[PDB]
Design a protein around this ligand. Structure first.
Ligand SMILES: Cc1cc2nc3c(=O)[nH]c(=O)nc-3n(C[C@H](O)[C@H](O)[C@H](O)COP(=O)(O)OP(=O)(O)OC[C@H]3O[C@@H](n4cnc5c(N)ncnc54)[C@H](O)[C@@H]3O)c2cc1C
Ligand SMILES: Cc1cc2nc3c(=O)[nH]c(=O)nc-3n(C[C@H](O)[C@H](O)[C@H](O)COP(=O)(O)OP(=O)(O)OC[C@H]3O[C@@H](n4cnc5c(N)ncnc54)[C@H](O)[C@@H]3O)c2cc1C
Ligand SMILES: O=c1[nH]c2ccccc2cc1O
Ligand SMILES: O=c1[nH]c2ccccc2cc1O
Lengths: 340, 340
């Protein structure tokens, strides 16, 4: 069978890998190709810090809770494997700061060592009066993506750089299944008004003395829109920008300053941190992830489509559970073709 | 008054600074000079990771508990000051792992967010079945010492590189007070059989994905003698060697292997961590810190001596409280000379 994955961000490469893993032994030939117009260094995925953390509150689809946790559990089980620095996976503890009390997150038990911040800890952060501490996981995109590529390449999965203009063009080329993992740009293949960009900007800084993450929460500013600091392997991520509908892939001076001054306020030690880089990206915002099947009509033959996009600011957090769900959908397609 | 501080490790440079801070405004001239035979890069203090952590259990002198805490409190209050990276001071959380249950440490409340390790956390460390998690502080010697040197130099404190053969030679030179902060080598100046070296060796490794500390505890091997990993600013410290009475300042192959293999076991991700350096040093082991006065007789004139040594493996942990205690002792000397 001929499978075409459109997209080479986390969702794409993940799904690809997941499908190949689970079906390659059971499909006559399983021919999987990845089509993407941008690869690693240049994806939204490579701009992400990679911190595992879902939305605070119980969503539209609570199946997303399950997917985030399946991912957490999966990563945690390879955190101590000699392979982990190749996937850019490591454990990290830190703070969630709020101006007043709030309910414990659903995922409070998924993470390691969840607890409420003590007063002496809150004294370190004058502007916030309540919060949490826990241990979570960081999966760095730049690495993860490269890791995924290597696995895929070894499994015979071929990569092509191209902008796909239509599902039809791909089907007409003889794809049996199109897995659509196109992120913020999915609407160009099939209009989806519920999908929009959540523009972000981040700074990368040399501040290696920083061992914890600090995420602030501000109802006035909203999700992803208040100061955060997330230490990584080579560099500390400074962020706090969320701009719905903004399609400008250009670093903005005002946003730079907003990030810089919010983070320096959050942690004064930052003031002399050397700036290494700055990047913008597009969160594929949507009320729900679209993870589902669809048969495209096109010709005497109908083409099977697995949509897998709209993962907002929690795509690394959620990717594995989605990838496995995408894999079940594929297996169902096979059971229909009576190909297993 | 003429004061001679012997020693330019943390204890010396601290005490120096502390005495100058508190008395310079009240002493006609306060002439302070530091004599030391080795400075920064080459002190025991520069081989220390810098992790604040006292002995688990209530000691001989419980005044040491108060000193450790005064140091903790004092550091915590500057952790978020734009100055902190200059002293090499930062916050860091991590693990204490034991083979079975044990009582909470005395300092359980001094630290941030103390708690018992949960099962899922213990599953990460197959060889241990109990433990703690908390947040503490690291103060890196190489930096701290450099910071202390700069403060002192600005306060007119003069430094000389010399090996002092006797308290007498210093007193004869016209010192009014000798502050003895000679660490493991104090016995050469006045025999002290209770003082001995706790030889240590450490590796410094590039493992920047490592954001927590891990201290293991083994009654069979004893204090400082089982595997530890303590992330720093530029590098991760691998240790787990304690050899009482060993005066060999030479990296040992066996100990290297011991450290390497214990830490790799502790955290498999280390296996591909690049080795940056390796260093040995002498913990000035004693049943108690010697922090006290003594009048040397020498000639028609008696010389005042403040001893401040024997800080084992917790000198950075304890240094500030000792430094303030030494400063009181100095003030008392002044009140005797009726010089205030
Ligand atoms: C500032 C910022 C911080 C973030 N931080 C985190 C975090 O800490 N933790 C977390 O979980 N997530 C984080 N994210 C979220 C994460 O980056 C996204 O959810 C995720 O990267 C989206 O993955 P994707 O595969 O859906 O998209 P992408 O990585 O954008 O990949 C989409 C792919 O589709 C290709 N494509 C699109 N259209 C076509 C076409 N028509 N033809 C061919 N190819 C096409 C593109 O070239 C690209 O390969 C953050 C996002 C941003 C912007
Ligand atoms: C492997 C290892 C790991 C450690 N880890 C930690 C840790 O993580 N946290 C922590 O709290 N502490 C730690 N320590 C402990 C800390 O290193 C010591 O307690 C502390 O460094 C001792 O400080 P000092 O001033 O007492 O000795 P030093 O730093 O050795 O300074 C003594 C000074 O006296 C001078 N001197 C001696 N004799 C003479 C003389 N006769 N004439 C002139 N000068 C003289 C020397 O040149 C030197 O300048 C560690 C120690 C080791 C060895
Ligand atoms: O999009 C984002 N996603 C995240 C997910 C987890 C933790 C922080 C963030 C910050 C962002 O800017
Ligand atoms: O001497 C040491 N002192 C310490 C103090 C605190 C935590 C770890 C250590 C390890 C050592 O080897």
């Amino acid at each position: 069978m001929r499978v075409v994955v459109i997209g080479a961000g986390v969702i794409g490469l993940s799904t690809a890998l997941c499908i190949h893993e689970r079906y390659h032994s059971v499909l006559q030939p399983l021919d999987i190709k990845v089509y993407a117009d941008r690869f690693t260094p240049l994806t939204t995925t490579d701009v992400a810090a990679g911190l595992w953390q879902p939305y605070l509150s119980d969503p539209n689809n609570p199946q997303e809770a399950d997917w985030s946790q399946q991912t957490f559990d999966y990563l945690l089980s390879h955190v101590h494997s000699p392979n982990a620095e190749n996937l850019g996976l490591f454990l990290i503890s830190g703070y969630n700061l709020f101006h007043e009390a709030i309910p414990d997150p659903s995922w409070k038990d998924t993470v390691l060592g969840f607890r409420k911040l003590t007063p002496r800890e809150l004294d370190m952060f004058p502007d916030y009066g309540y919060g949490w501490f826990h241990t979570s996981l960081i999966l760095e995109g730049k690495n993860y993506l490269q890791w995924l590529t290597e696995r895929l390449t070894e499994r015979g999965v071929k990569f092509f750089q191209r902008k796909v203009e239509s599902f039809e063009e791909v089907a007409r080329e003889g794809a049996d299944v199109i897995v659509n993992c196109t992120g913020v740009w999915a609407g160009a293949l099939q209009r989806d008004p519920l999908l929009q960009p959540g523009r972000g900007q981040i700074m990368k800084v040399d501040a290696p003395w920083m061992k914890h993450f600090i995420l602030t929460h501000d109802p006035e500013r909203g999700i992803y829109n208040s100061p955060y600091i997330i230490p990584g392997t080579q560099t500390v991520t400074l962020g706090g920008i969320f701009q719905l509908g903004n399609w400008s892939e250009l670093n903005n001076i005002q946003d730079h300053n907003t990030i810089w001054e919010g983070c320096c306020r959050l942690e004064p030690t930052l003031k002399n941190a050397r700036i290494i880089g700055e990047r913008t990206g597009f969160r594929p915002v949507r009320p729900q992830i679209r993870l589902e099947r669809e048969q495209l009509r096109t010709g005497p033959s109908n083409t099977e489509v697995i949509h897998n996009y709209g993962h907002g600011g929690y795509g690394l957090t959620i990717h594995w559970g989605c990838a496995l769900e995408a894999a079940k959908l594929f297996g169902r397609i096979l059971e229909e073709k009576k190909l297993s």
